[PDB]
Design an enzyme around this catalytic site. Structure first.
Site, mmCIF file in Angstrom:
data_model
loop_
_atom_site.group_PDB
_atom_site.id
_atom_site.type_symbol
_atom_site.label_atom_id
_atom_site.label_comp_id
_atom_site.label_asym_id
_atom_site.label_seq_id
_atom_site.Cartn_x
_atom_site.Cartn_y
_atom_site.Cartn_z
ATOM 1 N N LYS A 19 0.763 -1.354 0.370
ATOM 2 C CA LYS A 19 -0.079 -0.066 0.154
ATOM 3 C C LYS A 19 0.698 0.897 -0.391
ATOM 4 O O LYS A 19 0.541 2.528 -0.162
ATOM 5 C CB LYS A 19 -1.191 -0.182 1.025
ATOM 6 C CG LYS A 19 -2.019 -0.661 1.292
ATOM 7 C CD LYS A 19 -2.724 -0.195 2.379
ATOM 8 C CE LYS A 19 -4.147 -1.882 2.707
ATOM 9 N NZ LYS A 19 -4.889 -1.587 3.611
ATOM 10 N N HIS A 47 0.916 -6.147 18.124
ATOM 11 C CA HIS A 47 0.419 -6.558 18.304
ATOM 12 C C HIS A 47 -0.345 -6.788 19.450
ATOM 13 O O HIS A 47 0.417 -6.753 20.043
ATOM 14 C CB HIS A 47 -0.215 -8.059 17.532
ATOM 15 C CG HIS A 47 1.659 -8.570 17.877
ATOM 16 N ND1 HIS A 47 2.194 -8.596 19.337
ATOM 17 C CD2 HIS A 47 2.730 -8.659 17.037
ATOM 18 C CE1 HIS A 47 3.976 -9.175 18.809
ATOM 19 N NE2 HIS A 47 3.629 -9.003 17.580
#
Ligand SMILES: CC(C)(COP(=O)(O)OP(=O)(O)OC[C@H]1O[C@@H](n2cnc3c(N)ncnc32)[C@H](O)[C@@H]1OP(=O)(O)O)[C@@H](O)C(=O)NCCC(=O)NCCS
Ligand SMILES: CC(C)(COP(=O)(O)OP(=O)(O)OC[C@H]1O[C@@H](n2cnc3c(N)ncnc32)[C@H](O)[C@@H]1OP(=O)(O)O)[C@@H](O)C(=O)NCCC(=O)NCCS
Ligand SMILES: CC(C)(COP(=O)(O)OP(=O)(O)OC[C@H]1O[C@@H](n2cnc3c(N)ncnc32)[C@H](O)[C@@H]1OP(=O)(O)O)[C@@H](O)C(=O)NCCC(=O)NCCS
Lengths: 115, 115, 115
Positions: free
Chosen positions: A55, A103
């Site tokens: 991206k 995370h």
């Protein structure tokens, strides 16, 4: 330029029960498989980082950039480092890639800044 | 400079039942409404990207920067592009805006880097 | 370079019941404690921002960078600002730090870009 990605760890876990190796080996090279140590949260993370890289270069993962064109490695202090093929590095005209992962609570996310 | 935003998709969904159009048309222009295709996760995403843009410029969404001052469009490869009013672009003194979006598992997030 | 971090707000809340002050005062200076106003989501956020800063400098929180080496403050418009010790700023060779925070639905996240 910038790219970012958020992935459900659980969704990665359930794709790690898709002939196990068939999934992993599509996006992780052997050395990257060593880095994640079978840990679903680390695998989710490398996945998120590769998506985020695609991206950031504005192409996504298609036929201009494969998952395996993106090499993730670790610094001695466990900092994520990211490199492209020396060719791809020129084709996209890249000076430097900067990456990060995190995370918690069922989610992995990653971000990449390209120069 | 950098801005980031994380939005509950579900929270956007429940604000899309607030006279529907009354919500959407406050932050999305018609063309941006075409881009999201009625999809709650894409709407959450443009919302997150506009918030992230306002944080990156350090003003937030107030009376120095409206939601509608921020135009989101898409590249041919579906990469999010962001532009401000040509005036606002000068008032904030911006060279370039770089953006990215992602969603998974009930959440959308976006990040913007301003030069 | 870039760093990012995602934290469960609930996990911060349950560590704010670990002798309360013993947790908070490890990573927040008094002035930063004033900024968060007892709000678990703001505390999660400063925590995430300090982690993100340590990842952006590629050291993490160890004995090269303490939580208390990272000072968070707010602009008049409530924009998060981040500074290191004037020494640490030289030791890491930093021109400027750019930061951002967001929270929604049980999660805080932060990102930092270092020059
Ligand atoms: C290192 C530290 C800052 C990260 O703590 P944390 O908030 O639990 O980090 P997260 O769970 O969000 O993610 C850990 C990731 O941080 C990244 N990381 C670890 N050390 C790092 C460093 N020195 N620089 C940059 N990134 C780093 C890693 O990619 C790691 O993920 P992986 O091991 O699966 O590749 C923390 O241990 C600390 O120092 N305190
Ligand atoms: C394109 C790709 C990288 C994104 O997959 P993904 O991890 O499901 O992406 P997410 O669900 O996090 O978000 C999709 C977003 O990525 C962004 N995106 C899509 N293509 C892109 C491109 N070529 N460059 C940059 N960003 C892109 C879009 O904004 C899209 O959201 P929207 O369609 O609602 O605007 C993936 O399809 C792939 O190539 N593999
Ligand atoms: C300010 C605004 C853009 C943020 O709304 P939001 O999407 O609810 O923001 P989030 O809940 O993701 O996080 C709020 C954070 O944005 C950051 N923020 C607030 N005002 C800001 C500004 N002018 N510039 C940059 N960041 C800002 C703050 O760090 C705040 O967290 P804290 O108060 O706990 O430190 C919004 O109120 C608006 O203007 N509309």
């Amino acid at each position: 330029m910038i790219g970012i990605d958020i992935v459900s760890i659980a969704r990665i876990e359930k794709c790690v029960k898709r002939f196990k190796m068939k999934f992993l080996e599509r996006f992780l090279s052997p050395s990257e498989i060593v880095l994640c140590k079978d840990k679903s949260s680390s695998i989710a993370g490398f996945f998120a980082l590769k998506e985020a890289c695609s991206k950031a270069l504005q192409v996504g993962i298609g036929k201009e950039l494969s998952f395996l064109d993106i090499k993730i490695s670790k610094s001695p202090k466990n900092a994520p480092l990211i490199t492209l093929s020396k060719e791809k590095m020129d084709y996209f005209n890249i000076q430097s890639l900067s990456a990060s992962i995190s995370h918690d609570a069922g989610f992995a996310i990653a971000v990449v800044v390209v120069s």
